[PDB]
Amino acid sequence: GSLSGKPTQIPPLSDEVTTRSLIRENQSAVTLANKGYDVVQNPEVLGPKNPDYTINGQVFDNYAPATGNVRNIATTISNKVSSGQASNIVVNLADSSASPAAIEAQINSYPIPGLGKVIVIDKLGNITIIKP
């Protein structure tokens, strides 16, 4: 496991909501690096886009749902992919009441076009994988 690249700096004026999403991104990086992934934070990459991480080489983005509405969580991911051009998503359940199990079921019974690897981190720091 490993952790490099500059970690995300949270601007002082950011409110509680925005602040909490940046916290959880910096936290997902550390949690994964300690689980054996090689994690680069805020990697330089070609596109106009600036991804959150690189996880064993693959560009990844953090998504830290506060909602517990599993369907909506899927809808959200789906659109982050279709409109935002996200592919591989770290889904951090720190502030969500939605079970890792239920997310996997949802993403499987309704595939999401474009969606890459999904890594779930539950409230206890347990990693599950949902593969492309």
- Point out the residues that are catalytic: 25, 52, 61, 80
3-state secondary structure the chain: CEEECCCCCCCCCCCHHHHHHHHHHHHHHHHHHCCCCEEEECCCCCCCCCCCEEECCEEEEEECCCCCCHHHHHHHHHHHHHCCCCCEEEEECCCCCCCHHHHHHHHHHCCCCCCCCEEEECCCCCEEEECC
Residues near another protein (CB under 8 A)? 8-15, 17-18, 21-22, 25, 42, 48-52, 61-67, 71-72, 75-76, 78-80, 82-84, 86
User: Per-residue contact track with Br ion, 23 to 62, x per CB under 5 A?
Assistant: ----------------------------------------
- Among positions 1-20, residues that touch Br ion (CB under 5 A) are 9-10
